[PDB]
Copies of this chain bind each other. A is one copy, B any other.
Amino acid sequence: LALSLTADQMVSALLDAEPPILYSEYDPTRPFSEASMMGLLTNLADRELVHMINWAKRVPGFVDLTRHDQVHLLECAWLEILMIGLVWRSMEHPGKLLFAPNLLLDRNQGKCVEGMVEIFDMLLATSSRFRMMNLQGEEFVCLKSIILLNSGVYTFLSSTLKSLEEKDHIHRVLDKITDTLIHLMAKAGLTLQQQHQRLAQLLLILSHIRHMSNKGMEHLYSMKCKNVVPSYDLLLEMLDA
């Protein structure tokens, strides 16, 4: 079971579970309009969702949960997960966001609402921060898994002993991933003080990622397209192998 993994075993499992990088729809009309870019981003996200499920199922401890809880975590976290992926990819492209290898955008290219440019600006900042911190791949997979387990946990609520067990199991897996992060940092040769400071610096960034997702989710719901937001039923369907 997941709770028995060593730090080295957890890292290996997470790295192996990594999803592929997808391309955006090839050769779209350029310049973009507000709708056309959204069409590209939405299509891309839709295609990544499938791979995210595959990834999620390989996150140690995820499948120990009921299907309902597995769906609830994905519901709450999908955009955060996509965004941290985006920020990781964009690290060595200052001033730009690498949504896909064939879709590298600066803050002016894509046509966007001014609410969108704020989010874009926030994504860029986060990416620079990771660049500055010299974030490592092994740390990234830990953070992405933390987002998956953490984002929807406080809203299980609640009662039943089983509901409590589920929450308890999530927190224990979270603890193991924390252990893993620290193990990586110590292994790298950071002092105890630097280890504890870096951990905190990384986790605090997650709150910003939650903010960006909240803002993005907000915009998504204001689109009279009745969908790019995956439903509970859709996510559940996708979960059944």
Chain A residues proximal to chain B, CB less than 8 Å: 118, 121-122, 124-126, 128-129, 146, 150-151, 154-158, 171, 174-175, 178-179, 182, 192-193, 195-197, 199-201, 203-211, 214-215, 218
Contacts and interface: CB of A to CB of B under 8 A. Distances in A.
Contacts of A210: 207-208, 210-211, 214
Q: Tell which of A196, A207, A214, A215 has the most Cβ of chain B within 10 Å.
A: A207
8 contacts: A121-B155, A125-B155, A129-B154, A154-B208, A171-B201, A174-B201, A178-B197, A204-B206
Nearest to A146: B204
A157 B121 contact: yes
Contacts of A158: 125, 128
A195 B199 CA distance: 12
Contacts of A126: 154
Given A192-B192, A199-B196, A211-B214, A204 B157 contact: no
Contacts of A195: 196
A200 B214 contact: no
A50 to B, nearest CB: 26
A63 B175 CA distance: 36
